[PDB]
């Protein structure tokens, strides 16, 4: 979002796997910050979800 | 080539600076695209100098025909990359940013290339002066001594 | 400029321009010697045209 | 070689000799040469 | 080109700053348009110096025209670019900001390519001296006692 | 021109330096308009030599009509640009500042081409020495009465 | 060879970078594999100057087929690495990226060896000019009357 109230474009990156221990959940490129930023990662699953040390990489 | 429009050329420089492409979460918008078509436009008038500039095959869009993006540019299958290099560090300022070296350099290089064959073709000698006799070699036979003739 | 001047007026908004000729007629021409005149010369050769040509 | 060769004359910057241009085209009326110094964008005219 | 009044002029040299346009959500300031305006008519009746300076077809305000924005500015499709990019760096001040290196090395290089069509004019030869022999084989010189060039 | 009076050019100096504007929220005392106006005139007295200066249509303003800010400074509309970034970079010091880059390098230009045409109209050539002989080909153009040339 | 198709260049050159490899756990997104194979297809035409640049053997995708990747580049086994060291090199800012010193130092290498036989090839030496006789030791020639080359 870049207003706080009305999100953006949604894309799908693939958050587990059966037996992949190790995965590296990333988006390489993100945009250019106008103002303001904000975001949702939003997740829909049967399995347990474990997130941990959202970063960023702004230049 | 997938790029064919001026609004491909102006997404390749969005795309190269960073600032915008097909993969970011947030994109720029109309307003600053048309007018990144209209540094583009500007820019290739500057360059093409009514004809005595380089000359590129682009093709100028009018103001009946509406939008001035989506007007196929003209350019040849070579220039494309020379093209929306110059525009991306054209239109960079306008974001704060400032186009990096590798940018810089492949802009120079293709600005290079667009003009070699143009300045090739430009490199010719004028001919003979006013006061230059032909020779007899030449002036025996048909008797021309002052001619020099530009048939080739 | 004035010395030149071969006509007594100048042409004028709707003047009328009456032709001469209103019917056929084999022409009769009269001259002095000094009018036509005939400028001649021979082609220079050994150029584009005439290439080879003896 | 005598015939078609550019001849001996100086090599200028449009930017140099802008508004002096009759200075140089050769005549006498005139005491020296006269060379813009400074620009609107560097500050000054490179020195070659 | 879509850039066709003074006011498209000061648009483009405000985005081309960071101080106007879309890429930020600034937006443009009608204080901050007429002084612009009053720059750029200054910039250009300083440049075209009574016309003995650089020759653009900038088409000059009249007192009577209460608006001097809204105008059309009058230059061919060639010289935009110059013009709002020297327009910006010289307005730059204003803001106490400071145009980048990119905006000032587009600057030179538009206003040199705005002087080398009348540069090229201008080269011209002077004729011969005064004082110089029409020589014996100007036929037609040696016929009416055309002797010496007529000179200035 | 919209800047037709003497605080009008100190007006557009101060708007460079960024102190004062038709836009900030403070101004300027009139006794600091009347010192920067102060300013201009000695520095346009100093430019004029008293006639052998840098000529530029200046006119003074006499003591009997009370307040220069108000007159027409007389200059040309291609004088403007020169005469206030000359005015700024000189009054700058006032309000601790110190004029950025671009206003000193266009103080500097716009001076230069101030001078330009004075510079060209003053590149006169001195008669001939009276220690010179006419010549004999200039026989019949005096018909033979003096021989050297007059000097002074 | 392994590296058979762009689609093989353009892998290479992001594990180069070190954007999407196995010694990182980051796979290629298919939203870079098209932004890379459109640089790879604009820096190709721009070398390949119409049959005048780098001749490489490269194959050109027409828009007839669907995809642009997939279809072997046909270089041959020598140009391969040129050519995905170059386009690291080009696609590095795409990232806000910089490839290293190796990757610039591999990249003019490559390039250079590319010209290296084309440049021995062009280096060609021009007849002799029309004007410059045979001789009298070339008997069949002088015999036959054919006393001076023909040029061109």
Request: aromatic share 10%; hydrophobic share 35%; with cysteine.
């Amino acid at each position: 979002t870049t207003d706080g109230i009305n999100y953006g474009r949604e894309q799908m990156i693939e958050q587990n796997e059966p037996f992949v221990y190790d995965k590296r959940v990333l988006w390489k490129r993100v945009g250019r910050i106008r103002r303001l930023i904000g975001f949702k990662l939003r997740v829909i699953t049967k399995s347990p979800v474990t997130l941990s040390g959202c970063q960023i990489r702004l230049e | 080539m997938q790029i064919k429009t001026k609004g491909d050329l102006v997404r390749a420089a969005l795309r190269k600076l960073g600032v915008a492409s097909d993969a970011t979460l947030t994109d720029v918008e109309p307003q600053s695209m048309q007018d990144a078509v209209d540094d583009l436009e500007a820019m290739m008038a500057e360059w093409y100098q009514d004809g005595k500039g380089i000359i590129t095959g682009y093709v100028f869009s009018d103001d009946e025909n509406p939008p001035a993006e989506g007007d196929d540019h003209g350019l040849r299958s070579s220039a494309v990359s020379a093209v929306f290099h110059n525009l991306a560090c054209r239109i960079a300022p306008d974001y704060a940013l400032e186009a990096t070296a590798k940018i810089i350099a492949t802009a120079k290089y293709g600005k290079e290339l667009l003009y070699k064959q143009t300045a090739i073709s430009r490199a010719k000698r004028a001919p003979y002066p006013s006061r230059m006799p032909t020779g007899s070699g030449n002036s025996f036979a048909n008797l021309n001594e002052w001619h020099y003739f530009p048939g080739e | 400029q004035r010395a030149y001047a071969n006509v007594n007026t100048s042409l004028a908004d709707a003047m009328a321009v009456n032709i001469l000729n209103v019917k056929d007629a084999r022409t009769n021409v009269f001259w002095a010697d000094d009018a036509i005149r005939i400028v001649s010369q021979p082609i220079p050769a050994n150029h584009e045209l005439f290439a080879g040509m003896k | 070689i005598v015939a078609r060769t550019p001849k001996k004359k100086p090599f200028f910057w449009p930017e140099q000799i802008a508004g002096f241009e009759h200075m140089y085209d050769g005549n006498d009326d005139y005491p020296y040469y006269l060379l813009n110094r400074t620009d609107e964008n560097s500050g000054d005219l490179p020195t070659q």
